[PDB]
Amino acid sequence: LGKDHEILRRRIENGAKELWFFLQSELKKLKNLEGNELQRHADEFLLDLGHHERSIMTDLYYLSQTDGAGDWREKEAKDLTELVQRRITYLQNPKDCSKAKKLVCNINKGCGYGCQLHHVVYCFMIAYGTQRTLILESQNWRYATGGWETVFRPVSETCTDRSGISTGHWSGEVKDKNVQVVELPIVDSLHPRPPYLPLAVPEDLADRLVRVHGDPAVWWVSQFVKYLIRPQPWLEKEIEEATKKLGFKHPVIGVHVRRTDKVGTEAAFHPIEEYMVHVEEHFQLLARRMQVDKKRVYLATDDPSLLKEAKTKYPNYEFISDNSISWSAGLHNRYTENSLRGVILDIHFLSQADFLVCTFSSQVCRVAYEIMQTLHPDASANFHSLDDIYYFGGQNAHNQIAIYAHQPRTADEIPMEPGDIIGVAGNHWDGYSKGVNRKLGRTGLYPSYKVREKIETVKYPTYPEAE
Amino acid sequence: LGKDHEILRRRIENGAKELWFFLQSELKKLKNLEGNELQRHADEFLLDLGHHERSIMTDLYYLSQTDGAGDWREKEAKDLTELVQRRITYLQNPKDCSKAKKLVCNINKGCGYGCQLHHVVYCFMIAYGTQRTLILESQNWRYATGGWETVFRPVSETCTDRSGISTGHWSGEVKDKNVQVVELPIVDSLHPRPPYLPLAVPEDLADRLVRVHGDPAVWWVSQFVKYLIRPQPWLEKEIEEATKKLGFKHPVIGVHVRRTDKVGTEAAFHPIEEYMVHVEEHFQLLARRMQVDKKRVYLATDDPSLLKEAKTKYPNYEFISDNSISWSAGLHNRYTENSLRGVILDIHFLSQADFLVCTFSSQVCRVAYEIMQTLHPDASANFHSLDDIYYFGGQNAHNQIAIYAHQPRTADEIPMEPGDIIGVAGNHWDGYSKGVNRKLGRTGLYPSYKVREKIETVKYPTYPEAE
Numbered sequence: 001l002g003k004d005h006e007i008l009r010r011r012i013e014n015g016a017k018e019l020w021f022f023l024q025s026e027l028k029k030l031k032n033l034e035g036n037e038l039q040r041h042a043d044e045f046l047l048d049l050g051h052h053e054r055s056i057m058t059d060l061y062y063l064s065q066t067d068g069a070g071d072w073r074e075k076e077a078k079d080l081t082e083l084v085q086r087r088i089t090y091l092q093n094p095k096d097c098s099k100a101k102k103l104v105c106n107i108n109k110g111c112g113y114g115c116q117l118h119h120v121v122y123c124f125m126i127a128y129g130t131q132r133t134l135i136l137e138s139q140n141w142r143y144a145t146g147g148w149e150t151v152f153r154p155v156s157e158t159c160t161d162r163s164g165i166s167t168g169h170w171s172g173e174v175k176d177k178n179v180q181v182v183e184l185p186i187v188d189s190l191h192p193r194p195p196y197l198p199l200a201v202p203e204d205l206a207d208r209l210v211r212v213h214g215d216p217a218v219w220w221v222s223q224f225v226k227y228l229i230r231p232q233p234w235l236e237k238e239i240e241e242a243t244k245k246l247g248f249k250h251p252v253i254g255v256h257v258r259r260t261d262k263v264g265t266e267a268a269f270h271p272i273e274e275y276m277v278h279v280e281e282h283f284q285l286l287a288r289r290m291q292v293d294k295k296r297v298y299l300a301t302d303d304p305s306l307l308k309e310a311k312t313k314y315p316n317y318e319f320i321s322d323n324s325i326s327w328s329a330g331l332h333n334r335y336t337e338n339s340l341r342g343v344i345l346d347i348h349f350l351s352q353a354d355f356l357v358c359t360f361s362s363q364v365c366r367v368a369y370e371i372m373q374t375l376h377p378d379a380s381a382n383f384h385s386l387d388d389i390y391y392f393g394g395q396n397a398h399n400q401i402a403i404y405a406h407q408p409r410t411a412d413e414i415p416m417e418p419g420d421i422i423g424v425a426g427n428h429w430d431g432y433s434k435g436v437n438r439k440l441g442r443t444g445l446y447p448s449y450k451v452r453e454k455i456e457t458v459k460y461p462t463y464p465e466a467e
Numbered sequence: 468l469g470k471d472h473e474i475l476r477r478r479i480e481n482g483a484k485e486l487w488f489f490l491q492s493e494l495k496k497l498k499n500l501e502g503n504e505l506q507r508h509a510d511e512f513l514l515d516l517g518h519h520e521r522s523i524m525t526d527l528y529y530l531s532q533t534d535g536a537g538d539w540r541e542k543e544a545k546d547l548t549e550l551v552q553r554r555i556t557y558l559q560n561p562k563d564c565s566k567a568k569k570l571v572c573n574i575n576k577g578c579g580y581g582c583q584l585h586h587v588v589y590c591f592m593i594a595y596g597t598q599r600t601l602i603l604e605s606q607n608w609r610y611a612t613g614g615w616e617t618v619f620r621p622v623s624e625t626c627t628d629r630s631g632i633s634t635g636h637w638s639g640e641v642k643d644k645n646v647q648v649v650e651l652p653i654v655d656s657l658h659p660r661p662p663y664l665p666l667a668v669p670e671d672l673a674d675r676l677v678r679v680h681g682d683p684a685v686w687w688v689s690q691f692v693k694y695l696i697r698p699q700p701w702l703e704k705e706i707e708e709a710t711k712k713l714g715f716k717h718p719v720i721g722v723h724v725r726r727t728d729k730v731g732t733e734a735a736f737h738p739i740e741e742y743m744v745h746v747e748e749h750f751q752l753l754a755r756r757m758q759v760d761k762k763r764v765y766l767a768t769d770d771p772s773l774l775k776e777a778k779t780k781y782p783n784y785e786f787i788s789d790n791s792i793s794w795s796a797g798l799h800n801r802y803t804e805n806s807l808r809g810v811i812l813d814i815h816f817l818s819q820a821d822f823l824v825c826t827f828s829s830q831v832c833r834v835a836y837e838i839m840q841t842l843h844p845d846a847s848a849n850f851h852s853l854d855d856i857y858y859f860g861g862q863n864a865h866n867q868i869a870i871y872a873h874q875p876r877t878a879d880e881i882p883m884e885p886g887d888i889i890g891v892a893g894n895h896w897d898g899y900s901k902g903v904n905r906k907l908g909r910t911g912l913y914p915s916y917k918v919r920e921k922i923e924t925v926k927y928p929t930y931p932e933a934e
């Protein structure tokens with residue numbers, strides 16, 4: 001056993017104890033306070049708690065690194081990426097294009113870019129599970145009528161032709177076993193649904209993945225995103241240039257303020273302070289472990305009036321942003337090639353950030369979060385969403401398992417017994433989550449710490465000839 | 468890397484987050500409450516926090532065990548114990564008694580048993596550091612005129628004769644290099660003081676000790692206590708007998724309520740509820756990890772009237788206590804052979820307990836704490852003292868090092884910069900400790916989590932001839 005590992009574990013153990021002493025002590029005093037005097041000490045209480053908590057969280061990070069834990073996790077996460085990408089490449093490049101089995105996907109989903117991109121990932125996962133090579137029809141793309149290869153490398157190097165001796169619409173893996181080319185519709189109307197869907201992970205990879213990653217469902221998704229967004233040489237250049245011109249350097253926290261048409265339809269308005277309290281909170285955390293030259297925030301928004309307001313309210317923050325891209329995100333100009341390349345860059349610099357604050361209700365932020373997973377080993381915790389937790393549009397039921405019994409204090413809370421299956425709908429970022437105890441058919445609130453993630457696996461193809 | 472280790476590490480990391488979310492949420496609500504409504508929600512808050520906190524502490528225990536950590540820690544602590552015990556035996560048993568160098572200790576220190584026993588340990592440790600065999604003059608012992616061998620095996624099997632060609636009082640290890648027999652006074656008057664004192668640990672053992680133990684200073688002390696309290700055969704039997712007769716079985720929490728003459732002179736009165744709130748708290752922690760048939764408490768006190776009061780107020784508790792021993796511990800009868808074996812037995816069963824609640828100001832509880840260290844690997848945390856932190860009467864200055872900067876909010880608090888040496892005076896068990904910033908000569912309070920234990924080492928004999 002490692003000496004540093006033991007010293008850290010004990011320091012974490014003690015930090016929780018001294019925190020518990022501190023909580024009981026100050027709360028006992030708080031019960032005897034009123035009005036103005038109450039609020040001052042309550043605020044001072046929260047101030048001391050923040051540092052105390054971040055001190056514990058810092059040691060928890062150090063524990064995830066000592067005695068080669070960081071080095072090993074980096075190596076193992078590398079092999080998993082290499083392994084999966086190896087299989088996808090093998091699958092995508094058959095020797096004979098005319099005789100390979102193909103699954104056709106059309107990009108023109110009536111929605112934004114992130115929603116459109118996730119439809120392709122959804123297509124890619126099924127083709128992987130069904131041992132079919134992906135053919136992507138991308139003409140008349142609303143962001144770039146030229147097609148997919150306007151910005152990204154083609155999904156295949158040997159088989160982009162869609163021909164085949166038998167073609168039909170999707171009817172199931174078994175029924176379509178003798179159809180060479182299968183046309184896949186969008187997931188919103190898919191019938192029947194196959195097992196090769198989120199949030200399930202490959203049977204053969206689950207054990208290795210959980211050992212490494214804190215949310216293996218996103219990593220499995222991210223591997224298909226990594227492959228898709230292989231840039232054209234000119235796109236790779238534009239990224240490198242924008243990086244230099246914007247002064248993009250670490251440490252930097254990415255922020256995505258989605259507004260315009262999202263407000264009122266799929267999400268709500270969120271003031272700049274709502275995002276920034278978590279940025280400053282995380283910057284305080286980083287300062288506990290490293291020298292912070294400047295507090296950098298890469299702002300990505302479809303509200304161009306925001307950047308000036310952000311600079312004013314936060315003078316000690318260097319905001320890295322391309323305000324002309326924010327204008328390209330406008331509604332009248334959204335579906336053009338220039339706006340497409342703008343959001344691609346915004347997502348890129350968002351994913352490169354050391355931390356990501358946003359609303360996960362927006363498809364835009366979810367992509368940057370997923371791409372972030374391909375850049376670090378187990379980057380699953382490096383975010384804070386203002387509303388929704390992570391999901392994937394069209395996923396199978398996200399389920400948790402109750403580990404501690406809960407008795408409802410109000411009618412808004414549901415009771416839980418250990419073993420009960422809880423269908424989670426989100427986290428309220430206040431200690432409680434909302435869901436339904438499937439056992440009782442009751443929907444309500446419950447303590448977030450009293451449940452546990454139920455990881456699902458699916459018997460995927462392992463593509464051993466890819467080695 | 469171990470799979471369970473990572474799952475636990477992630478759970479602990481997340482559990483702290485959800486606690487922080489829970490804290491910020493509920494505290495914001497409390498700022499708008501007064502009087503009865505405030506205290507109701509505040510007390511309900513504390514209840515949720517208690518369970519929430521203990522869940523994290525449970526995971527920390529599970530983390531200290533997975534992937535062979537328990538087996539390895541036990542083996543390494545076994546080797547350390549065996550090694551030290553191996554070395555002590557060699558020192559105490561020279562072939563030629565008349566020619567061996569000896570350190571003579573007189574047991575009749577004007578104080579209680581724990582203080583008297585600790586005086587011998589103080590004597591024993593110096594004899595170890597100076598490569599002298601310990602000679603213990605124990606006749607006219609206030610507890611047993613027969614001497615040390617009334618209850619315990621003699622410290623030596625070959626050399627208990629104090630004869631020697633040269634004898635003199637303590638003047639320092641260097642000056643006494645050619646004095647065969649050196650008479651050691653009590654630590655309260657020792658001049659000059661040698662380095663072989665608490666809380667310093669042997670140089671050659673520090674690396675293995677820190678890897679295993681959370682407070683190696685106590686473990687080093689316990690090794691000399693373990694050797695000393697080897698029981699005479701009649702005592703060894705009675706120990707086994709008392710176990711059966713009392714129904715002593717695990718799980719059990721030991722409690723030591725020292726009163727009578729201690730109040731007003733060296734400590735204060737403490738109600739039974741003061742002890743019992745921590746028992747119930749720790750039993751709830753144990754209940755999270757094991758089946759608890761009955762809540763067992765081994766009560767040890769010199770107040771025999773207490774057991775009735777304790778049984779009354781806590782009907783669902785099984786109180787294991789020998790009320791006649793509490794009576795034998797009475798003031799008029801305290802210094803007799805029967806009372807001696809009573810406190811020896813109380814200390815024994817206290818050390819056997821899974822947890823220890825008491826006042827560390829009493830020498831009695833400190834012994835039970837020290838003996839506990841010889842029964843488990845790193846049993847240093849299985850306690851809660853109502854007043855003093857652990858100390859050893861006559862120790863060199865207990866020092867800590869500030870690791871986080873503190874700015875005084877009041878005048879009662881001291882400022883701290885990282886690296887500052889803080890001479891600690893105690894822990895208030897409320898988030899704050901009391902001490903002196905040696906750098907500034909300022910004494911006051913400071914957050915307990917912002918400091919770190921400064922471990923001290925001292926070149927001690929390796930005693931290779933023993934292996």
Ligand SMILES: CC(=O)N[C@@H]1[C@@H](O)[C@H](O[C@@H]2O[C@H](CO[C@H]3O[C@H](CO)[C@@H](O)[C@H](O)[C@@H]3O)[C@@H](O)[C@H](O[C@H]3O[C@H](CO)[C@@H](O)[C@H](O)[C@@H]3O[C@@H]3O[C@H](CO)[C@@H](O)[C@H](O)[C@H]3NC(C)=O)[C@@H]2O)[C@@H](CO)O[C@H]1O
Pocket residue numbers: 578582585654655732733734735828853854855856858859860861862863864865890891892893894895901
């Ligand atoms: C050889 C032998 O056994 N000598 C005993 C002698 O040591 C006892 O004195 C007590 O020693 C402890 C420990 O002292 C060490 O650590 C101290 C930390 O400051 C150093 O200053 C010192 O040099 C040693 O390294 C002291 O903590 C005790 O003082 C506490 O209790 C007395 C009352 O008896 C009180 O007046 C003091 O102010 C102090 O109070 C404690 O303070 C802490 C923090 O504020 C509280 O959490 C805790 O509740 C308080 N405890 C109590 C009991 O009030 C002693 O000086 C001596 C015991 O009387 O017996 C000798 O045999």
Ligand SMILES: Nc1nc2c(ncn2[C@@H]2O[C@H](COP(=O)(O)OP(=O)(O)O)[C@@H](O)[C@H]2O)c(=O)[nH]1
Pocket residue numbers: 111112113114115116256257258259262300301302325326328329334339342343344346361362363364
């Ligand atoms: N460049 C840029 N474009 C954005 C930003 N926010 C929204 N947009 C545009 O608005 C579209 C929103 O569509 P979508 O990706 O499906 O995600 P949604 O926010 O959940 O509707 C994006 O595709 C962009 O074209 C932003 O921060 N930067």
Ligand SMILES: Nc1nc2c(ncn2[C@@H]2O[C@H](COP(=O)(O)OP(=O)(O)O)[C@@H](O)[C@H]2O)c(=O)[nH]1
Pocket residue numbers: 578579580581582583723724725726729733767768769792793796801806809810811813828829830831
């Ligand atoms: N059997 C028994 N004796 C006790 C107990 N508490 C105190 N005594 C007696 O009181 C003495 C106190 O002396 P000492 O060990 O130096 O510790 P201190 O006076 O509490 O600091 C002990 O040695 C016992 O003889 C107890 O709980 N059980």
